[PDB]
Amino acid sequence: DTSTWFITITSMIMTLFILFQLKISNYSYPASPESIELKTQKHSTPWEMKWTKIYL
Amino acid sequence: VQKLFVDKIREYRTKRQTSGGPVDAGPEYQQDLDRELFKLKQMYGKADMNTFPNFTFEDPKFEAVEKPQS
């Protein structure tokens, strides 16, 4: 109850923070998916500008 | 009036017999038509009596420019 002596649990808590940093590290953010559509637009526009400079 | 007519024909033939040209004109008709033609030739043009004209002309130099495309 008023328990005692403490040599227990606290060494078994930091092994747990090797688990939770393994699972939650492999998550996906919805926002990152909206960023890859932006750089694809500017690249072909500059490639068309490279084709416009191939005209001009 | 034929006898008056041949009297005119006589005086035309004595006007045909000339050796000094204008007998009644004198310097009056000589200074007039010499100054009249030179006043008209100044409006006409300075051209000689036998000099045939010949010349050449220069055409424009067809130049070019630069324009970088493709």
From Swiss-Prot, chain A:
Gene Ontology MF: a single term: proton transmembrane transporter activity
Transmembrane segment boundaries: 4-20
GO cellular component terms, semicolon-separated: mitochondrial membrane; proton-transporting ATP synthase complex
Major subcellular site: mitochondrion
GO biological process: proton motive force-driven ATP synthesis
Parent sequence residues shown: 5 to 60 of 67
Keyword terms: Acetylation, ATP synthesis, CF(0), Hydrogen ion transport, Ion transport, Membrane, Mitochondrion, Transmembrane, Transmembrane helix, Transport
Keyword Protein biosynthesis part of the UniProt annotation: no
Provenance organism: Sus scrofa
Designated name of the protein: ATP synthase F(0) complex subunit 8
Swiss-Prot record, chain B:
Source domain of life: Eukaryota
Major subcellular location class: mitochondrion
GO cellular component labels: mitochondrial inner membrane; proton-transporting ATP synthase complex
Protein name, as recorded: ATP synthase peripheral stalk subunit F6, mitochondrial
Organism: Sus scrofa (Pig)
N6-acetyllysine: modified positions: K3, K8, K41, K46, K61, K67
Protein purpose: Subunit F6, of the mitochondrial membrane ATP synthase complex (F(1)F(0) ATP synthase or Complex V) that produces ATP from ADP in the presence of a proton gradient across the membrane which is generated by electron transport complexes of the respiratory chain. ATP synthase complex consist of a soluble F(1) head domain - the catalytic core - and a membrane F(1) domain - the membrane proton channel. These two domains are linked by a central stalk rotating inside the F(1) region and a stationary peripheral stalk.
Localization annotation: Mitochondrion; Mitochondrion inner membrane
Residues where N6-succinyllysine is found: K46, K61
Modified residues (Phosphoserine): S70
